[PDB]
Amino acid sequence: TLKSFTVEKGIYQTSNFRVQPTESIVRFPNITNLCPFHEVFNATTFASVYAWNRKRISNCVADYSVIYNFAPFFAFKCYGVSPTKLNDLCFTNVYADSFVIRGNEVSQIAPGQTGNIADYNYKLPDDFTGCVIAWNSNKLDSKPSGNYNYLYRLFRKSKLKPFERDISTEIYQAGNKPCNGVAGPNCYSPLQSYGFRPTYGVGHQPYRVVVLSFELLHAPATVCGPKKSTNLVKNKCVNFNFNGLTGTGVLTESNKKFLPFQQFGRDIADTTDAVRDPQTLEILDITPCSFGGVSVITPGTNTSNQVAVLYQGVNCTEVNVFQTRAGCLIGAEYVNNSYECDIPIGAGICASYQSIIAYT
Amino acid sequence: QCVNLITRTQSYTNSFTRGVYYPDKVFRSSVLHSTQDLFLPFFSNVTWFHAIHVSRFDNPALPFNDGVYFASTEKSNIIRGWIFGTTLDSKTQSLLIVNNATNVVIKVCEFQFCNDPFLDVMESEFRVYSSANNCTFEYVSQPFLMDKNLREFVFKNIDGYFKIYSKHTPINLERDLPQGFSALEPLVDLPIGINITRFQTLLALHRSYLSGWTAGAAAYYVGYLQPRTFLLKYNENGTITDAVDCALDPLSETKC
Amino acid sequence: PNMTQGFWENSMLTDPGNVQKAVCHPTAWDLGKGDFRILMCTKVTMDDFLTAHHEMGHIQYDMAYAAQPFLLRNGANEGFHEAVGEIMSLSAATPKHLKSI
C-alpha cells in the first residue's frame, strides 16, 4: 500500500474487510391459484378435432410439471421455446386446445404441414410459439362395437386459417348441381366419424392432443411460472431475493409492527431496513453484512516485523484479541498500565512496542 | 333493456385535506417523505353529485382525467360499483366493478353499456349493459363496500395497472368531508392494460311491486387528481398521520 | 420392418383346444386399420417353420402397401402375393440359413 520496503512506525489503513455471503435465499409468496392443467389433460370427455376445445388461461401460476408428469407422451415437440425455460418465463395468455385424432395424423399438428387435419380441422401458423403434446388413449376412447362420437372434417371448400374452427355441417357440394340439404350423389356430409376400436394398428389408435399456445401482448404478463421458494435462513449474511427485491444481508428478528398492506421497509435515507416474509407473515430486519477498514499497526521495520490488525467498526465475535470502541484489535495485548501515546488507535486506546501492547 | 331513470344535479364543495393515499407498499416509520404522484390537491374544488330517481337522459358520463377521487356518505347498498372505459360500447374494452352483499366482481369485457346504467334488485345486470363479448379479465374477491360512514376511494390508471385505494371513516356531526387526515390504503392493483378516459357510477334500484322502481337518492363527491408533490408524515407505527401540499401556499412550500 | 405389437397380441399362433373349434388352414389376414394377423395352427416341424416364413412374407407384403388407398391394397397381379412368401420359403430352407440359426 505504501509502495515501500521500509515502513515507519505508525498505523496505516491498508485494506477493507468484508463478510462474504454464504448462502442465497429466494423466498417467494406461497404458491396458490394453480392454473387448471388438471382439467385439460385429464377430462372425462374430449372433443372432436373439427370442434376442438379452446380454454384460455390467464391470472394464474403455470405449474407445467404436472403436464410433464401426466402420462407418457408420444411427442412433446415445442416450436419456438425450449422445454425447460418455460417455468422461468412469464407469458400473458396461454391457450390450451384439446382434441382427439388418429396416430398417423399426429405429425400434422405442426407448422408447415398438410393433410386432412391441418387443412380442414386444426391449423397452426408458421410462426407458432408453443408446444404440442399427444398421448395414447386406447383405454378411454376405444369401444369394441366402435366409438362413433369422435368426428373430423374431411371435405371443405377452402383451407382453414391458423387458429380457426368451422362448426358448419353444410352438405359439401362437390359437383355442379345444388345439393338442397339432403344427402345424395356428389353431395357428401363433411363430418366423418373416427370409428375407434381397441384392436387397431398403432397409427390408427385414438390419440389425445393438447396444443399449448403462448401469446404476449401489450398488457402486463400475468401467467408467470412458479419461482422456487427456498427455506429461510436467519442470523447469517445471505443474498436475499424477497418478491423481486435483491440484496445481501443478515435477516434478524424485527420488533416493527407493519400494517397489513405493507411489504417492504425503508430508512430515512431511502435504504431498505425491513421486509415482510411472503410465506409467513413475519417482519425481518434486513441488516447488511459487516465490513471494516483493515488498518495495520506496526513499529519500524528497523526494530521489528510484528504487526497488529485493527478492524474498524467490527465486533470481535464477527471476524491476543481485544475489543475496543474503534473496532477489533488482533495481535496486541491489553495492559492496564497507562503510558504516553505512541501509535494512535482511537477512543483513548494507543499502541506501542515493548510484543505490541495496547493501552489507554 | 336500457332505460333512462336517473337525473343528476351538481354542486361544488371544498376538498379540505381529503384524498391522501399510500404511494407505495413500503413501511416508513417516524419520517418525512416527499413523493411526487397524482394526488388530490388540498382545498380543491370537488363536485358533489346528487342522483335522484323519482317514481329523458340527465345522467351524463364523467371524464376520468388522470385519476378520480370518489367519496360517499351513503350506505353500502345504494352505490354498487363503477364503470371505466373510453367509448363505453362494444367496440372498445371496458372495466366493470360490481359489489354485492357477499363479494366484489371486477371484470374487463367488451360491454355494450346503457346510457343510464343501474343494478336492479336476486340482482340483474340487464339494465347495466345489453351485451358483453370478448371478455378478457375477471377477478372476484372480498367486497370493499361494507357497513354515518364515509367511504373514500382513489382510482388511478398508470402504465397498464388500475390502482384502487380505499378508506372508511366513522364521521359524525360534521360536513361529509371531515377535517383531519385519514390516509387511504392500497386496496387492489389490477393488471388491466386498457385506455380509460371516462367513468360512471353504478347505483342500485329496487323494484316497486305496486313507477316500476322505488324512488331513491344517492349523493357522492368526485375530485380529480393532479401531478403534485406531497410531503407525508410517517409516525412511529408507519401510519400517514399528516401531509403538506408543496404547491398550495408559501408556508407549506417552505415546509416542503 | 419389425412385427407390430397388435400382431403378437391378437394372432392365434397355437391351436386353442378341443372346446373351441377353429379353421386349421394357414392364412394371413390383413384386417386393415393397421391390423395384421396370422391364423396358423402351428406345430413343431421344419414344414410349419417354412410356412410361417411364407405367411410372414404375406404379412410383410400387406404391411408395405398399407399406406396406399384401400382399393389398391393388393398385389400388382395375382402371382406377386404368393411369390414374395415363396421366396422366403426358398431362402429359409437352405443349409446355410439352418447352420446360421
Ligand SMILES: *[C@@H]1O[C@H](CO)[C@@H](O[C@@H]2O[C@H](CO)[C@@H](O)[C@H](O)[C@H]2NC(C)=O)[C@H](O)[C@H]1NC(C)=O
Ligand atoms: C353476489 O355476487 C356473486 C358473484 O357474482 C354471486 O355468486 C355467484 O352466483 C352465480 C349464480 O349465477 C354462481 O354461478 C357463481 O358460482 C357465484 N360465484 C361465487 C364466487 O360465489 C352471488 O350470487 C351474488 N349474490 C347476490 C345476492 O346477488
Ligand SMILES: *[C@@H]1O[C@H](CO)[C@@H](O)[C@H](O)[C@H]1NC(C)=O
Ligand atoms: C387423472 O386421470 C386418472 C384416470 O383414472 C384419475 O385416476 C385421476 O384421479 C386423474 N387426476 C386428476 C388430478 O384429475
Ligand SMILES: *[C@@H]1O[C@H](CO)[C@@H](O)[C@H](O)[C@H]1NC(C)=O
Ligand atoms: C404458507 O404455506 C404454509 C404451508 O402450508 C402455511 O403453513 C403458511 O401458513 C402459509 N402462509 C400463508 C400466509 O398463507
Ligand SMILES: *[C@@H]1O[C@H](CO)[C@@H](O)[C@H](O)[C@H]1NC(C)=O
Ligand atoms: C368550483 O367550480 C365552479 C365552476 O367550475 C365555480 O363556479 C366555483 O366558484 C368553484 N369553486 C370555488 C370555491 O372556486
Ligand SMILES: *[C@@H]1O[C@H](CO)[C@@H](O)[C@H](O)[C@H]1NC(C)=O
Ligand atoms: C370481438 O367479437 C367479435 C364477435 O363477437 C369478433 O368478430 C372479433 O374478432 C372479436 N375480437 C377479439 C379481439 O376477440
Ligand SMILES: *[C@@H]1O[C@H](CO)[C@@H](O)[C@H](O)[C@H]1NC(C)=O
Ligand atoms: C384513449 O381514448 C381517447 C378517446 O377515444 C383517445 O383520444 C386517446 O388517444 C386514447 N389513448 C390511447 C393511448 O390510445
Ligand SMILES: *[C@@H]1O[C@H](CO)[C@@H](O)[C@H](O)[C@H]1NC(C)=O
Ligand atoms: C402505535 O403502536 C403502539 C403499540 O401497539 C400503540 O400503543 C400506539 O397507540 C400506536 N399509535 C401511536 C400513534 O403511537
Ligand SMILES: *[C@@H]1O[C@H](CO)[C@@H](O)[C@H](O)[C@H]1NC(C)=O
Ligand atoms: C425392431 O428393429 C430394430 C432394428 O431396426 C431392433 O433394434 C429392435 O430391437 C426391434 N424391436 C424389437 C422389439 O425387437
